[PDB]
Design a protein around this motif. Structure first.
Motif, mmCIF file in Angstrom:
data_model
loop_
_atom_site.group_PDB
_atom_site.id
_atom_site.type_symbol
_atom_site.label_atom_id
_atom_site.label_comp_id
_atom_site.label_asym_id
_atom_site.label_seq_id
_atom_site.Cartn_x
_atom_site.Cartn_y
_atom_site.Cartn_z
ATOM 1 N N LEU A 194 28.819 9.537 65.932
ATOM 2 C CA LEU A 194 30.172 10.001 65.701
ATOM 3 C C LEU A 194 30.358 11.363 66.375
ATOM 4 O O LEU A 194 29.421 12.160 66.437
ATOM 5 C CB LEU A 194 30.423 10.103 64.198
ATOM 6 N N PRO A 195 31.548 11.645 66.911
ATOM 7 C CA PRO A 195 31.743 12.904 67.641
ATOM 8 C C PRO A 195 31.492 14.130 66.773
ATOM 9 O O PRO A 195 31.854 14.166 65.596
ATOM 10 C CB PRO A 195 33.207 12.830 68.086
ATOM 11 N N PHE A 196 30.868 15.141 67.379
ATOM 12 C CA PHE A 196 30.617 16.433 66.736
ATOM 13 C C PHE A 196 29.858 16.276 65.421
ATOM 14 O O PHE A 196 30.066 17.026 64.467
ATOM 15 C CB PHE A 196 31.918 17.199 66.514
ATOM 16 N N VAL A 224 41.271 10.127 54.649
ATOM 17 C CA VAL A 224 41.024 11.553 54.768
ATOM 18 C C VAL A 224 40.859 11.903 56.237
ATOM 19 O O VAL A 224 40.598 11.047 57.083
ATOM 20 C CB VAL A 224 39.783 11.993 53.972
ATOM 21 N N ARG A 225 41.022 13.186 56.533
ATOM 22 C CA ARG A 225 40.772 13.674 57.876
ATOM 23 C C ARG A 225 39.277 13.625 58.169
ATOM 24 O O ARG A 225 38.442 13.598 57.264
ATOM 25 C CB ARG A 225 41.304 15.096 58.031
ATOM 26 N N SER A 226 38.940 13.611 59.457
ATOM 27 C CA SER A 226 37.549 13.424 59.850
ATOM 28 C C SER A 226 36.676 14.633 59.563
ATOM 29 O O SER A 226 35.455 14.536 59.712
ATOM 30 C CB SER A 226 37.468 13.086 61.336
ATOM 31 N N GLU A 227 37.261 15.763 59.171
ATOM 32 C CA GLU A 227 36.477 16.974 58.958
ATOM 33 C C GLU A 227 35.721 16.946 57.637
ATOM 34 O O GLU A 227 34.608 17.476 57.550
ATOM 35 C CB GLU A 227 37.385 18.198 59.022
ATOM 36 N N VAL A 228 36.303 16.345 56.596
ATOM 37 C CA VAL A 228 35.658 16.351 55.290
ATOM 38 C C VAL A 228 34.427 15.457 55.261
ATOM 39 O O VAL A 228 33.586 15.601 54.370
ATOM 40 C CB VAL A 228 36.647 15.926 54.192
ATOM 41 N N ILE A 229 34.302 14.527 56.207
ATOM 42 C CA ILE A 229 33.111 13.691 56.291
ATOM 43 C C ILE A 229 31.993 14.359 57.082
ATOM 44 O O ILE A 229 30.824 13.986 56.924
ATOM 45 C CB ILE A 229 33.456 12.323 56.902
ATOM 46 N N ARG A 230 32.315 15.337 57.927
ATOM 47 C CA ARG A 230 31.292 16.071 58.656
ATOM 48 C C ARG A 230 30.856 17.337 57.936
ATOM 49 O O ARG A 230 29.698 17.746 58.069
ATOM 50 C CB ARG A 230 31.795 16.432 60.055
ATOM 51 N N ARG A 231 31.757 17.975 57.188
ATOM 52 C CA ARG A 231 31.384 19.172 56.442
ATOM 53 C C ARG A 231 30.364 18.845 55.361
ATOM 54 O O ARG A 231 29.295 19.461 55.292
ATOM 55 C CB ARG A 231 32.629 19.810 55.832
ATOM 56 N N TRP A 232 30.674 17.871 54.516
ATOM 57 C CA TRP A 232 29.729 17.324 53.561
ATOM 58 C C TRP A 232 29.236 15.982 54.088
ATOM 59 O O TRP A 232 29.529 15.591 55.220
ATOM 60 C CB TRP A 232 30.372 17.189 52.182
ATOM 61 N N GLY A 248 31.424 3.863 49.232
ATOM 62 C CA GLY A 248 31.064 3.862 50.637
ATOM 63 C C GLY A 248 32.200 4.381 51.492
ATOM 64 O O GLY A 248 33.367 4.371 51.106
ATOM 65 N N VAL A 249 31.850 4.832 52.693
ATOM 66 C CA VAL A 249 32.792 5.437 53.624
ATOM 67 C C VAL A 249 32.832 4.597 54.890
ATOM 68 O O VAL A 249 31.788 4.319 55.491
ATOM 69 C CB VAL A 249 32.404 6.890 53.947
ATOM 70 N N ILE A 250 34.034 4.197 55.294
ATOM 71 C CA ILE A 250 34.262 3.462 56.534
ATOM 72 C C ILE A 250 34.830 4.436 57.552
ATOM 73 O O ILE A 250 35.861 5.069 57.304
ATOM 74 C CB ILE A 250 35.216 2.277 56.326
ATOM 75 N N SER A 251 34.166 4.559 58.692
ATOM 76 C CA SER A 251 34.611 5.435 59.763
ATOM 77 C C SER A 251 35.076 4.596 60.942
ATOM 78 O O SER A 251 34.481 3.560 61.251
ATOM 79 C CB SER A 251 33.495 6.383 60.201
ATOM 80 N N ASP A 252 36.146 5.038 61.594
ATOM 81 C CA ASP A 252 36.723 4.305 62.710
ATOM 82 C C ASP A 252 36.418 5.008 64.022
ATOM 83 O O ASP A 252 36.408 6.239 64.096
ATOM 84 C CB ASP A 252 38.235 4.145 62.546
ATOM 85 N N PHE A 253 36.157 4.213 65.053
ATOM 86 C CA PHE A 253 35.893 4.717 66.388
ATOM 87 C C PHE A 253 37.080 4.537 67.321
ATOM 88 O O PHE A 253 37.032 5.011 68.460
ATOM 89 C CB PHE A 253 34.663 4.021 66.977
ATOM 90 N N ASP A 267 40.048 5.922 66.931
ATOM 91 C CA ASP A 267 40.382 7.332 67.097
ATOM 92 C C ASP A 267 39.519 8.167 66.160
ATOM 93 O O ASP A 267 39.266 7.750 65.014
ATOM 94 C CB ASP A 267 41.895 7.571 66.939
ATOM 95 N N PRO A 268 38.953 9.267 66.623
ATOM 96 C CA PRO A 268 38.062 10.076 65.777
ATOM 97 C C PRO A 268 38.807 11.150 64.992
ATOM 98 O O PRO A 268 38.483 12.338 65.044
ATOM 99 C CB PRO A 268 37.095 10.669 66.807
ATOM 100 N N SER A 269 39.824 10.731 64.246
ATOM 101 C CA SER A 269 40.563 11.669 63.413
ATOM 102 C C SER A 269 40.877 11.103 62.035
ATOM 103 O O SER A 269 41.671 11.706 61.305
ATOM 104 C CB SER A 269 41.856 12.099 64.107
ATOM 105 N N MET A 270 40.284 9.972 61.656
ATOM 106 C CA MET A 270 40.504 9.377 60.348
ATOM 107 C C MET A 270 39.179 8.894 59.781
ATOM 108 O O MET A 270 38.206 8.685 60.507
ATOM 109 C CB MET A 270 41.487 8.201 60.396
ATOM 110 N N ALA A 271 39.154 8.738 58.462
ATOM 111 C CA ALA A 271 38.052 8.095 57.768
ATOM 112 C C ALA A 271 38.597 7.520 56.474
ATOM 113 O O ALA A 271 39.590 8.012 55.938
ATOM 114 C CB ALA A 271 36.904 9.066 57.489
ATOM 115 N N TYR A 272 37.949 6.474 55.976
ATOM 116 C CA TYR A 272 38.386 5.794 54.766
ATOM 117 C C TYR A 272 37.302 5.882 53.707
ATOM 118 O O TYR A 272 36.150 5.523 53.963
ATOM 119 C CB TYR A 272 38.729 4.333 55.053
ATOM 120 N N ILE A 273 37.673 6.357 52.522
ATOM 121 C CA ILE A 273 36.780 6.415 51.371
ATOM 122 C C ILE A 273 37.290 5.417 50.348
ATOM 123 O O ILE A 273 38.406 5.559 49.839
ATOM 124 C CB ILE A 273 36.720 7.827 50.772
ATOM 125 N N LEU A 274 36.480 4.412 50.040
ATOM 126 C CA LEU A 274 36.865 3.359 49.111
ATOM 127 C C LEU A 274 36.297 3.679 47.735
ATOM 128 O O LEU A 274 35.080 3.811 47.577
ATOM 129 C CB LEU A 274 36.376 1.997 49.599
#
Lengths: 110, 123, 117, 110, 110, 110, 123, 110, 123, 123, 110, 117, 123, 123
Positions: G88-90, J68-76, J101-106, J108-115
């Motif tokens: 994943l990026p970054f 959620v935005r993609s930043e909260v999945i990289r910070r934690w 679980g968390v589903i991440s999309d490729f 666009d790298p600006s979204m993520a899904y938390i179920l």
């Protein structure tokens, strides 16, 4: 060359049965050939021998030609249209076969 | 409405030699029938492949569907006991299809559907 | 299951319609037989070797389309196996029906001593 | 250069069977070449030696050129169109091949 | 610079096979380059040495330039269009490559 | 030649029952033949001997022709239209059969 | 109709070393194949993740799908016994994909689909 | 010939019950026949004997004809329209039966 | 709205002789009823054919649906204990349909639906 | 295309203290992580709630999904072993979400899904 | 002839209950008959004896006719329309019944 | 199951409504009987042949629409089979209900010695 | 929005006599209630009929749905223990419906839905 | 977007008295809470009613859904242990709803969904 192999490969069909092979090669191909012949305003012959023979007997009109490949594929396109749909739904007057056939047309005007 | 020219794939139908071996199992030799043309329809979408099969034995099976002209079903008699070989372009690995039955339509008598398996090669 | 000594014994009545563990893809409307090995009695010598004959309990199934045909097939199988050099039938047949294909079945166990090699 | 390798790569279909290869390379490619050569209002030759031979025999007309890559690409586009669909429909004139072929037209006038 | 690496990265394709690499780099790239050259009404050369050599022999016309990056990416866009669709469906005359190519055009008018 | 084999092959429907065959070949095909013969403004005869007999009896009008293949194809198209749909709807005049039949029209005027 | 430029992700395909260890289990060392490009399609929607697996053992598995050009399937031979690594990026945590089979289409010979698992990392 | 067999085959219906057979053959067929008769501006008779008998008694008007097959199939099309829909939804004035019936029309004008 | 002329297939309905044989099983002889016309609707799509049936016995069954005029259901009484024979054009192999029930509609009294099985021939 | 301003809910992510108690069960004390923002998508429609769970024990569980935005999945590193607390406006009863679980999309790298699960509160 | 059998067959609904039959045959059919008789601008009588009786009593106006089959069919179409929908909506004038009834109109003028 | 000697015995009460292993497609609302063979005792001589009579344990099921009808059918079956030349009823009936069709059932085992040929 | 005139079918609702016979089974005699009108909606499509029922006993059951005005549900009290008789036009064989429950709508108080079974006749 | 005026039904929420009887079973007496308004959404379509429940015990249960304003969920605390009474217009038989859980939406804080059962009356 409008043989049996070319027609078989165009339609993607194996004409094993005598009845349908006879249908396609004796009622569906001559229709397309003579339709293109009527549209072109000239007679078209398969080989040079047939053209010379027709000119000798005088039955060939003015401006005859032996078929190029473009006219043969226009005939193939008309035949493919005939095979697909078998009704009178109503279609535009100028299809994609006429675009190929047009540069060989003669005696155009008003 | 068959729309020739979408039949862009050249397959190879072939059936099995008759009789049985010493034990009675089907003979693992294959005869030949001929070549025909058809339109292959995949199963796009997630979960379109089956992994397990039976006693926890791994597998990977994805069923397809071939749309053929009505002549190839009358010339031969394709049924569940045949297999179909098709080769991907510019490739040396050839898919082996396993016919699971033929669906014929009466709405127009110019199409037929052959449903294949394509997952595990047959012998 | 020792295939050949069962297939050659049951071929004449069924015209070679005997199969191991599975019916073929298109088996037809005529009766056919399926055999499968489901256990046996050991024949293992304690000295560290096993004999050249081994017991094996096979299962049999006949699948016709009419009830009379499967009854005759089962009785013929029972006679031919009870009049055999080294086989013996144990138990009695059990019937079964398959509504999807509309075929009638049968089932009986056989004890047989075959040649390992 | 309208070689078998280029045609196979363009159509994305290997032609192993002799009949299919004969059809594509003897009825279908020459039709596209004829159509483009007729739209350009000039004769096109694949190589310079053939052009010199045609000039010597006198059959070469005014403004003959050795085929550039753009004309090859347009001929390939027409060939792909012929290979894809095989029925006469109401397709429009001035397709995407005529955009590439147009700067090579010679006797445009009115 | 229209090398092999740039073409590989543009198309997102690995041209391992000799046949398709030859196709893309010898029939599909020169077509786009000479199409842009015909549209610009001038000759374009890769480096200064080639421009000087062509001027010395006199074969270079008036108003020549060595290719900037905008013309190179317009050529890349034309090539990407050629790779994707391989038919003659019929398209608008002015695409998005001409918007990049236009400020370098010369000899415009009536 | 409007034979039972050709009709069966065109309609893609074998006619084994006597009543269905009688209907198709005695109420439906002659209707299409009459309609085409009335649109052409001339008499059409299947074979030359019948044309000579009609001329002798005097019932043949001006400009009679022996039926070519194009007229047969158009008659088959009209027959297929009659066989497909069996209710009166708002279908348009000048269907796809009149495109094929039109060059054989004789007394077009105003 | 492949529409390059939507293939914005750089993956990393790699297969397993041949042979077996002392017990016969697959060797847990991984070789390398190379890099390719593909378009990843998620499973949006509720209930797209699987929690339990077998004897009440917790898990979290969500299957994906990678659309790749037809060349990467002919250069190598991707099948059920490979794994794919994408980053994943970054980010420093890299997803590990488990190939469950390849679906090839005959409608046009310029696409292929690789269906992955992405749930539990493989060894 | 507008017998019972032709009507049975046109509608794809078996008229076993006395009530519905009577309905179709005695209220639904004469309606279509006399509607076509009113549109044609002339009287139509089934056979030559009926035409001669009507002329003898003087009840037959000028310009009478015995029905061709095209008029019979137009009547069949009107009947098929009557059988299908049984309401007053509102339809175009000129249907597909009038295209068949028109060339037999008489006394047209202003 | 029945739209005659779409009823382009000529079927053949026939029922079974009454009584039982010595064992009580249904008599495997078949009488005749007559001919009617109907519109056959297939099951297009993948996984439209059923392979296994019961104790692991192979099969290939694909259900169809025939739309008939309301008269053929009142003239006879078609129910689950009949069979329907239809022949594909220009072919000698004839499909054997097994009626599984008749659905009648009250929205308009001019249609009826006969749902058949078409998979394994009946006797 | 993330369209900020639809992220109108302020959640509260928090994870569990490490280690085990005397018996080895997870420690029922909860640490804190921080606050983020997300868009919650419900499961509208009938039968969207699950009543029974296991040995006939009553429950009421309805799964949601947080975008959620993609930043909260990289910070934690949010995974299945966390819980999320959100409070309904003008209310004192706070929902407790259980991350499955968390589903991440490729794409666009600006979204993520938390179920999440949201049914029974976690401890 | 607007008998109970014909009405039952047209509406495809048997009328066994006395109240429903009374409604259909005493409030609904006469309404359609009145509407058609008012649109035709003339009096219509079912049978010739009733017409003679009306002429004798003097109540018959100008141009009275015994009802033909086309008027019966149009009346049945109006009755089916009344039976199908039972609310006042924005349906258009000149429905499909007025196409059949129109040639029987008498005092058309302006 | 030996069909004929059971069908001819149970026909008069049920009017020929006895079927092997499966009810017909449309069986009606009247009571009917279904029989099926579910095992037996062997009658195989060790010398290498089997006797001309063989035991077989059949099962029986009556499926009426009213409870009284199936009770009477079962009691009549039990009487007629207990007063028979070579059959004997073992066990007692077991009831069953089918909500989809609203029919009442019964079930009892029979031991019988029939003629193999 | 009830759109009268689509209620073109005349049904016949009737309930069962109270009490029990000697054994306690429901009395197989049927009383009468009256006549109402409704719109019957079928189940078009393949696999809309159920063949097996229980211990391998053949059947053919196809559920319908009757839309009735709100008055017939208040005049009587239709529930699961009733049956509805309707006759097909120009036919002597009458369908017997088995009411499986009544769905009432609160969006507008002018409709109600009666879901029937229509497969096997009731007694 | 709540669109008042579609909330045309007046319900009656009420909860159960606390404590247990001698055996410990819930007390079969019911207290009162108050009245609110909501929009009831049915389950139209075939097979929307459940017949069997458990050990072959007949039933007829059809689940509904009530859309209520967000205030009635904050004033009280509706959960799985309540029941809702609503009366059909001009009728004396009153439906008894059984709350199976409340779904709250965070997309807009002005709606809530109460999913009920409505099949068998509660005590």
């Amino acid at each position: 060359a409008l043989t049996l192999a070319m027609v078989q490969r165009h339609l993607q069909a194996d004409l094993i049965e005598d009845d349908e092979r006879s249908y396609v090669m004796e009622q569906l191909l001559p229709a397309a050939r003579e339709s293109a012949e009527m549209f072109l305003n000239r007679n078209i012959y398969s080989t040079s021998e047939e053209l010379a023979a027709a000119v000798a007997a005088g039955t060939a009109g003015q401006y005859p030609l032996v078929t190029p490949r473009a006219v043969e594929q226009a005939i193939l396109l008309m035949l493919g249209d005939f095979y697909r749909d078998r009704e009178a739904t109503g279609k535009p007057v100028s299809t994609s076969a006429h675009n190929l056939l047009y540069p060989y047309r003669v005696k155009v005007g008003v | 409405p068959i729309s020739a020219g979408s039949l862009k794939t050249r397959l190879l139908a072939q059936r099995r030699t008759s009789g049985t071996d010493d034990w009675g199992a089907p003979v693992q030799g294959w005869s030949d029938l001929g070549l025909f043309s058809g339109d292959v329809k995949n199963d796009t979408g997630l979960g379109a492949i089956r992994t397990a099969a039976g006693s926890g034995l791994p597998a990977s099976i994805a069923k397809y569907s071939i749309k053929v002209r009505s002549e190839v079903i009358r010339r031969w008699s394709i049924n569940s006991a045949d297999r179909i070989i098709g080769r991907l372009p510019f490739s040396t690995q050839e898919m082996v299809f396993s016919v699971t039955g033929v669906i014929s339509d009466f709405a127009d008598p110019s199409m037929a559907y052959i449903l294949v398996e394509a997952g595990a090669d047959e012998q | 299951t020792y295939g050949p000594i069962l297939k050659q014994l049951l071929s004449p009545y069924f015209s070679g319609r005997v199969f191991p563990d599975a019916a073929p893809d298109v088996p037809g409307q005529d009766p056919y037989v399926i055999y499968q090995r489901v256990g046996g009695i050991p024949t293992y010598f304690t000295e560290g070797a096993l004999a050249d004959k081994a017991n094996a309990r096979v299962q049999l199934e006949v699948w016709s389309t009419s009830k009379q045909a499967t009854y005759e097939a089962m009785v013929h199988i029972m006679r031919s196996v009870a009049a055999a050099p080294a086989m013996e039938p144990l138990g009695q047949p059990i019937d079964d029906y398959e509504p999807a294909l509309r075929i009638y079945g049968s089932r009986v166990d056989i004890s047989m001593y075959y040649n390992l090699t």
